[PDB]
Design a protein around this ligand. Structure first.
Ligand SMILES: Nc1ncnc2c1ncn2[C@@H]1O[C@H](COP(=O)(O)OP(=O)(O)OP(=O)(O)O)[C@@H](O)[C@H]1O
Ligand SMILES: Nc1ncnc2c1ncn2[C@@H]1O[C@H](COP(=O)(O)OP(=O)(O)OP(=O)(O)O)[C@@H](O)[C@H]1O
Ligand SMILES: [Mg+2]
Ligand SMILES: [Mg+2]
Lengths: 569, 571
């Protein structure tokens, strides 16, 4: 029960309203004041029997009006539901905020799908128990103490004995609770993780579906998916062993009442015993259901308490034509296994520098550090007399547009994907022009409208060449100081590619552009070419210097001009 | 008529009705007790007092009978076991109709929805099926039970209640049919939006690159909370059940007191409150049945769908037939036949190719080729017998297609390659298959092959790495027809050559149809095909294009003057 304190604390912060809870707790006492006053008041029946007809015709009308108070008990149940629907939406509001602001490093260690269900399915665990959490416990403890005080006036020795029997035998309820906590956590972890599994097979059905998908993927889905939700059978098994344990704790009190009293009103003392036994069941299940919610929500607090990414610190310099620099910059996704090892290069402001290296040699990872995603292990980047964390992140993005390797698409239309950034600042005239430079506009027009044709799940309704150019157009819309293309014309045809490079050349004359290219034939006229092999920059400067670098580094034209000489002859 | 598709699916496809009988057995036993208590406990003031004369004989009247009082708890477990089986049962079912489901579905209703619409939709019925029967059966037993006792002591006013309560229970249907929609429509809303929150999270590495952290938080806040608090309207309707029941008995008070002997008058109103308690138990079950039917309404619609598997035609016993086309027209949107009337012959064993502009039907023609979609007017022949009379299930076993996108999933490098029917492969086969894709040389670098998780869509690996693994997967299956839809797009020209050289040795006497961005890659391709705006315009080796067509030259000749400048200044 030391695992109650760390989460009840978060339950408290998670509270947009409380005043409604008071109304539920007000009527709860009113109604329990009735049921404990019923056995003392309902002992006179002859009086009503005689005045059953004459008093019922003139004074008996008021008896029907009392169903309003009996109906007002239903609005108190609504208070448990309204504060339940607010506390469920409350945790939803909270966790989501610590996920969008969450650093990129988290999605390397802990999977995306895993964080989704432990946000939607985990929250719904507490809702179906918070409506009976307080409701069952409060009315339970009121009547337990209530019936006990009446018994304390009636008897002092035998009444005291129960208080040393039931709470001393309630220590056999903790192994039910402590094994209920880990039994609902493991289930709301294993299947929380397993929603995610279909979320990796189902969208990729378009590729997955061949003789591999046909049945083999049903098994991962079906065996794991079923055999792991049927772990709740073990949860329902432990829950059904509450009842006989409570029936066995009162038996220890029977020896402390009959065996102690009888040897030393006896019939009257055993009547009230069953009146405490009913709410005893109400209190006991609340304890187990509180551990059931703490178990489930144990994942929420750990995910909530995390180092978020900073937005505004020191100074927010928005307009500054700054040259990019590097000094002994080393980085790795794991301390023992590093990717970049002390790299230094100067990118001149205004002029288009480039980066070319073999696949798996550190280009994209250097650019991740560039668009400020990760922190270097030993080095830093020289910009506006600041390093990485102290300098403003919001301002850093506000004037820089980076189109990474992958073509990024989400649900909605082409308009939504481009108008992603600086929201409601862009007019119709701006998009048309931004998409024209990307060349996409020509074929955005072909299909029914720009704001009409939807992309779908990761943009499957559109071709590679179209989805790539839209991503360019998105960066073109913001008009940034530093543009970026990490193999942006990879699947894009050489004829459909030239038109793109020609438009960005006109725009970014007095503005910096750092690009990555698969074929050196594209980045022939690049101001400062950088060769990225196995994690360090080896070859610098234009093609006249690259051929003069080393023996191994000669492929700059050597491999591309080979397959070219064939067409001519 | 929406009740029937629930219980018929709950029966003939759901595993239950076993332990259910035991729960329904003890339910009658215990309700036979509570209706016999007011008739037997008439002399309980002496009944519970009779154990005084017997002495210590209490160890058989109460002590042993707590086993039967404890056996009621195992009957509650029977609801739970049949509940946990019926929930897992629907889960087993729906998943099967999703993997076997055709590609056309994920164009119209998307995945995100259909994913969460299983796992969250199934859990709606579990927390109600434990009190569904439990509350209704014990309810209806005691209602009829107390009513029959009222008949022997009263045969006039007892009949009046039966014409009051069920005639006033018609004000419970507007609660029920407005309870069906309020769970259904919300079980769309959540699923659809919670599935939409799952699209933003994996692509975060581009969310924190654009000013959109708070913009997408704003989609989440006003979106997920905005519609989850629609359950407030669901809990609102549910809390208006209680006063309606309290008001239906008031209509009976006029039909009992106002219509109705004076001694029995007090006795008739006592039993009235004994029916009123289980009345509440029956009424909430009706609303909670509509709550489950509403939720499960979209289960059945998703289950009842046309699957993707045939039986016509067996395998071919390792024989490569020639690929053909005759007036083949296709278009997702029936308004625009995107891939118009097309005819081309691909020679068996020969490495033919396809190159056209972006948006002109290459990949869409290959989707039809991999035989996913059905052509609107034409058909595909494979050795003068069409594609159809060989089933789909076997077609893919002999054909390996590596489409445009680089496909990656949660598993390691081994699980991605081994994917084409796992455990039917040995260690010697993978090593060789990965060597041909020239990824084996890069896998070795990192600690082990089998001990290297790729992650959510393989973010732990680079473009050049993830592309070659996909090629190795097809290389592992040793197929008759290989395919590369710009498989060397992000791949470096130096790291690319090694790949093309290995597949040239293997696919000598086996067909290979490829798509290329740069014509410089597919220079020596048997029969090049130009795919512009949906129809094949150019045919054969690029030399034909550079002489025949007067609008496809500058197109087939671009890659020549592009890098013709690399040997101008250097040499
Ligand atoms: N989470 C990670 N993200 C990126 N790279 C990682 C990660 N973990 C390890 N790596 C290592 O980084 C390499 C990829 O780095 P990077 O993306 O910069 O390559 P690249 O030079 O840009 O080549 P390509 O053009 O193929 O993407 C992997 O091959 C792997 O060794
Ligand atoms: N669901 C869909 N799937 C694929 N294509 C679609 C879909 N709906 C519409 N289309 C249209 O079909 C066109 C042809 O698709 P396809 O991928 O084959 O083009 P492509 O010529 O191969 O270009 P690229 O090589 O750049 O991908 C797309 O450009 C798109 O406009
Ligand atoms: Mg990269
Ligand atoms: Mg394509």
């Amino acid at each position: 029960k030391s695992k109650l304190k760390p989460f009840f604390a978060l339950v408290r912060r998670t509270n947009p309203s409380y005043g409604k809870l008071a109304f539920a707790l007000a009527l709860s006492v009113v109604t329990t004041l009735v049921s404990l006053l019923i056995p003392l008041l309902t002992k006179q029946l002859v009086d009503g029997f005689s005045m059953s007809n004459l008093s019922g015709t003139q004074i008996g009308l008021i008896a029907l009006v009392f169903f309003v108070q009996a109906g007002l008990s239903a609005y108190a149940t609504y208070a448990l539901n309204y504060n339940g629907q607010k506390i469920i939406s409350g945790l939803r509001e909270l966790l989501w905020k610590k996920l969008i602001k969450l650093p990129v490093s988290y999605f390397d260690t802990n999977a995306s799908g895993e964080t989704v269900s432990r946000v939607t399915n985990d929250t719904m665990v507490v809702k179906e128990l918070i409506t009976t959490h307080i409701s069952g416990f409060i009315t339970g403890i009121i009547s337990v103490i209530g019936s006990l005080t009446i018994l304390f006036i009636m008897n002092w020795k035998l009444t005291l004995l129960v208080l040393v029997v039931v709470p001393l035998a309630a220590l056999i309820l903790v192994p039910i609770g402590r094994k209920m906590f880990s039994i609902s956590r493991e289930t709301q972890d294993e299947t929380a993780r397993f929603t995610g599994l279909l979320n990796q097979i189902l969208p990729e059905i378009r590729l997955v579906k061949a003789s591999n998908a046909e049945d083999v993927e049903y098994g991962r889905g079906k065996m794991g998916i079923s055999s792991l939700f049927k772990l709740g059978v073990r949860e329902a098994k432990v829950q059904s062993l509450v009842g006989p344990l409570i029936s066995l704790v009162l038996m220890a009190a029977l020896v402390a009442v009959i065996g102690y009293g009888g040897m030393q009103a006896l019939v009257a003392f055993i009547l009230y015993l069953f009146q405490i036994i009913m709410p005893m069941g109400q209190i006991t299940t609340f304890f187990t259901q509180l551990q059931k919610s703490i178990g489930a929500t144990e994942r929420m607090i750990e995910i909530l308490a995390e180092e978020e990414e900073d937005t505004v610190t020191g100074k927010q310099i928005e307009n500054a034509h700054l040259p990019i620099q590097l000094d002994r910059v080393s980085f790795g996704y794991k301390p023992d296994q590093l990717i970049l090892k002390e790299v230094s290069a100067v990118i001149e402001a205004g002029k288009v520098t480039a980066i070319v290296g073999p696949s798996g040699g550190g280009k994209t990872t250097l650019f991740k550090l560039l668009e400020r995603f990760y922190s270097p292990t030993a080095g830093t980047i020289r910009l506006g007399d600041e390093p990485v964390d102290t300098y403003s992140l919001e301002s850093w993005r506000e004037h820089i547009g980076y189109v990474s390797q992958e073509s990024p698409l989400m649900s909605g239309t082409i308009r939504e994907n481009i108008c992603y950034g600086l929201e409601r600042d862009v007019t119709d005239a701006e998009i048309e022009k931004a998409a024209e430079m990307a060349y996409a506009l020509n074929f955005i027009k072909e299909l029914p409208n720009q704001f009409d044709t939807e992309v779908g799940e990761r943009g499957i309704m559109l071709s590679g060449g179209q989805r790539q150019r839209i991503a360019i157009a998105r960066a073109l819309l913001r008009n940034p100081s530093i543009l970026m293309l990490d193999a942006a014309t990879s699947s894009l045809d050489s004829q459909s590619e030239k038109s793109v490079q020609q438009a960005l050349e006109v725009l970014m004359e007095g503005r910096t552009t750092i690009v990555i290219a698969h074929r050196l034939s594209t980045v022939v006229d690049a101001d400062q070419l950088l060769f990225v092999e196995k994690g360090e920059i080896t070859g610098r400067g234009t093609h006249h210097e690259l051929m003069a670098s080393h023996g191994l580094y000669r492929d700059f034209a050597e491999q591309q001009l080979k397959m070219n000489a064939d067409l001519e002859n």
